[PDB]
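User: quick one
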Amino acid sequence: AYRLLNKTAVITGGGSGIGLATAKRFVAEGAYVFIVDVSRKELEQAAAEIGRNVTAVKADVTKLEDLDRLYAIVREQRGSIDVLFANSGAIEQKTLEEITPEHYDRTFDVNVRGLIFTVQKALPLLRDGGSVILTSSVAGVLGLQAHDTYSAAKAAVRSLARTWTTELKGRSIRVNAVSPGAIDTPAKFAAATPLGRVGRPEELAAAVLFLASDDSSYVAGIELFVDGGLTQV
Amino acid sequence: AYRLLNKTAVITGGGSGIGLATAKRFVAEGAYVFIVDVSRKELEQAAAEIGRNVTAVKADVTKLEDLDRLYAIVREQRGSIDVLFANSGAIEQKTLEEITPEHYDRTFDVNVRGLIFTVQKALPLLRDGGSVILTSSVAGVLGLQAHDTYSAAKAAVRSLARTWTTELKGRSIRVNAVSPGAIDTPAKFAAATPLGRVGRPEELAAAVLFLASDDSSYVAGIELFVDGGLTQV
Amino acid sequence: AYRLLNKTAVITGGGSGIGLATAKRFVAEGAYVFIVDVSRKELEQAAAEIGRNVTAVKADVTKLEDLDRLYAIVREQRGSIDVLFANSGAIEQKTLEEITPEHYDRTFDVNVRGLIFTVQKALPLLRDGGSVILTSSVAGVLGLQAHDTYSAAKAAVRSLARTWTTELKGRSIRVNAVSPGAIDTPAKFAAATPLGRVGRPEELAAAVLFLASDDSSYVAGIELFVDGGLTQV
Amino acid sequence: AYRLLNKTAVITGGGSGIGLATAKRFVAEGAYVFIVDVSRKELEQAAAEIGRNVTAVKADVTKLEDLDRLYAIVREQRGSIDVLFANSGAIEQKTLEEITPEHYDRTFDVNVRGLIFTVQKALPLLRDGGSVILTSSVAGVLGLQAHDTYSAAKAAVRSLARTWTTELKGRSIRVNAVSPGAIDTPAKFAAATPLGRVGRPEELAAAVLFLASDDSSYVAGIELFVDGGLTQV
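Assistant: Done. Structure below.
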């Protein structure tokens, strides 16, 4: 009944949207969860909503020193990590001719750099046999107007799942990417989507649970699309 | 606790290997299971192993009339299908120059023709919101010596999950393909596999469970690789 | 200037459309061409059009004996084959529920069976270092309404490039798939195509030329989409 | 006879390797080539090797002002660009745990940042109906030990081809990625490569030529693997 019973999870971008829904589903599956996000208020809100088996950590994942502090706290409170959901994502729309150094640095900092160090700094705490879920996107295999740097960064995220799969294999740590389509997070995607609707954060959390749990024990390096068929037809 | 509580599942190739493994896991999850295979004896053994909530049906899914009789039995005992796992596979190893018309016919009849019809005739029993999983293979994306027809036919399988995704969306039926790598069924594959081992049939069953269950509610038209990272790296 | 000077090419579906367009280009690049097709009239028109270095052979390539006759003619006139463009293809729209045994058989015969035996029976004639191009389709990676068997069969054709690449590597023979989008042969595809138009048969011929010629000597096993962007964005 | 007769090509990384191979082949095909790179010595040597119809321009394509300056020179000397080969590439091997912020910044600046601004700044000179080729890599779809950032950056590159295809379709500018496998540039990869050898730089230049020429006029948004079958089987 409790597919994650007594496992320790760390979830970044855990103050809202898909991170928050995964946190809630994880606690329901018997996990202890760390939610990590930038906004104090949102973390307090999110933790109260989760209500049990949860520590909230204020951290900007793009800042290395913030990650060291995160992982000291994790070390102190629970001692190790069974599941890491390295969830990050910020989309700013700009076409090629509109891109600035600035737009670029911010897109890649948040979507790639901070993901890379999130996972790097977590290695000393990851148990052998553990599971890492990277958030990529449908955008990482599409050519969408004005999504130049976002799509490119999320294709970078999916690649990291293959490299890490090779690198961490000696510790039996699985690394997989989840690639959400349109998720209803606080229409064109809905139009071309076979299931005919945006997905719910609940549905994305369920897909990450699979990747998190022993049910995906032979599943490694994959890109799991959770996009109601958007990219598959 | 029970992730297919009271759903009715149909599994073809249900008398052994991943079909049997899936049926045991499905019953564990509170589903009622129809196992379907060619051998009365194997089916009797299989049913005893599963032990409850199972009907065994002798059908050669490459024969249209056998599928008629299958679905009539399913219809009289349970009235509709929630999960159809259309699981077939016959592999015979011939290189291009060794291919006979009989080898071609048998390989495609069991892997493609029989699957098509299996799914066509399940249509009138399948519930709206139901889930259909097809058994593809990592061979469907690899260039493997002497696997000419089997690999070709398994790609045909993965393609059908796309077309069916588009054709059944009007009914909310999700169609997805599972692509197993090496599975231990009663070393070279294992050597190139990042998890470093063959998978257990129960690990394949678990991945089919995900597709079968509400956790995959926003997943449609995918190829789910269950191959320890073989095709991913 | 003459990219295929003194090369012997065999082209199936040679009497119209992409097959004829490829023959014409292959002739203008200095090749000696066999066009193979079922209709005498079309072949005579085609040979007249091509105008030089061409033998037209009336063969149904789904028939093993028509292939034996074809290749005895190839062997006696030109000896061995530098380039085989095993271009097959026919489509009939039927949804899953409309699928008949006749429909499936006819689709798989034309699109897969004949293609396997075409390439099988060319083996003793293929020069070492020669090039085999298969016609697949964008359909082999899409979920198109009512394209069930045509798409499934084209995916199979793409898979044969991979396996054949492994099997004939000893003889340095490259096998690659070409996947056309919409080609103009005497809107909806054109609507979703970035280039905003259907392809000319001449453009597909140019892509096949590339696989045919030395320019692609390091390219093997691939699926070259020629669809003005259809499957890529 | 001359496939780029009087076309203006801009090639970055043009002082060595596949850049230089491509410049040479392009001049053979009657183009006027600008070779762009960091080292004056290397540029001078490469310009003498090519021999005719070439300007060498010293530039760090990671610097916006060096690019403004490149395009001023191109604008003055030739007025417009028909073919842009945005070829960039630096690899340094580091495993995840070895990654420094500096290792990360260098890989992405060169392989991605530089690439974006290269094409962005080419836009006012690019003729309508022009052709843009981006160098990706087989690394972009593999999990190779210690290739974390390079493979990731190369997957970003492939994505950009998709996004640009959509952004630029209004001008009929085609954008495609070439993904080299192992290339002999001044055994492990040969081992898993169906062709059984490394690719020659001339062979990569031929493939880029295809993308640059009118033969690929209906080809957009693709990843063209030129890797002897490495990623295809």
